[PDB]
UniProtKB/Swiss-Prot annotation, chains A, B:
Suramin binds at residues 18, 29, 32, 69. Myotoxin activity is inhibited by suramin and varespladib. Inhibition by suramin may be caused by (i) distortion of MDiS from both monomers impairing the membrane disruption mechanism by the toxin and (ii) surface electrostatic changes of the complex that interfere with the toxin membrane dockage process (putative-MDoS is partially hidden). Inhibition by varespladib is probably through varespladib binding to MDoS. Belongs to the phospholipase A2 family. Group II subfamily. K49 sub-subfamily. Snake venom phospholipase A2 homolog that lacks enzymatic activity. In vivo, it displays local myotoxin and edema-inducing activities and is lethal by intraperitoneal injection. The myotoxicity effect is weaker in comparison to other myotoxins, probably due to the formation of high molecular weight complexes and to the oligomeric conformation (conventional dimer). It shows specificity toward neurons and myotubes, but not on a variety of other cell types. This PLA2 excites a cohort of sensory neurons via ATP release and consequent activation of P2RX2 and/or P2RX3 purinergic receptors. GO terms for molecular function: calcium ion binding; calcium-dependent phospholipase A2 activity; phospholipid binding; toxin activity. The keyword Disulfide bond applies. It comes from Bothrops moojeni. This is Basic phospholipase A2 homolog MjTX-I. It comes from the Eukaryota. GO terms for biological process: arachidonate secretion; lipid catabolic process; negative regulation of T cell proliferation; phospholipid metabolic process. The chain holds residues 17 to 131 of 138 of the full protein. The lineage of its organism: Eukaryota, Metazoa, Chordata, Craniata, Vertebrata.
Length: 121, 121
């Protein structure tokens, strides 16, 4: 779920997930996909595509286990759905931390953001 | 101050520092150094010994800034006692996380772990 997602993004970025990513760009926090506004947005685009792949489990509602180990997000190994769901969330939070370089809060979402159609996953 | 220490320890071990380290061994979260029981205890031994040097500043009470960049505690610069403090705290957080493989609940301080006198720092 977004309990582990939220925790991982904090774990990786140090930034609160809801406050920095709740409505960021076209993809972070908000529903659905848009064309990324920026690399951070892009991470979430990559994340929602990654969740799209996931059909036998509930990406947003299903909980899984991960460890904080060696300051690394290690997915609890398990269901191909959960494992890969965790992996999708591990990936997003890494990516998000990898792109704090260019986090522009100007992309936080005051209502509509003007997003273009997501290109195909 | 321990507020920072606690957060660092938490961000390093992702383990609650009061619950996990609050009374652990001869050196963690208790007053005084003792012969280190195990590695965690030894971390806190070396933590205390690192503090012993910081006499220009108050290790338990004095606030310093640090950042979590690239999943790394970065001491910010402040003073030399405070940067050193922050490094001591960060050292302990990291040692703590590097040794939780050998954490033992037996050093609860239900035991009050049979503490010998610590060799000099």
């Amino acid at each position: 779920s977004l309990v582990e997602l939220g925790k991982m993004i904090l774990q990786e970025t140090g930034k609160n997930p809801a406050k920095s990513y709740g409505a960021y760009g076209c993809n972070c926090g908000v529903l659905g996909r848009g064309k990324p506004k920026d690399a951070t947005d892009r991470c979430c685009y990559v994340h929602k595509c990654c969740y799209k792949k996931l059909t036998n489990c509930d990406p947003k509602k299903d909980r899984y286990s991960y460890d904080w180990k060696n300051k690394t997000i290690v997915c609890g190994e398990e269901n191909p759905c959960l494992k890969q769901l965790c992996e999708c969330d591990k990936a997003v939070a890494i990516c998000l931390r990898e792109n704090k370089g260019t986090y522009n809060k100007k992309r936080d979402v005051y209502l509509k953001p003007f997003c273009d159609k997501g290109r195909d996953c």
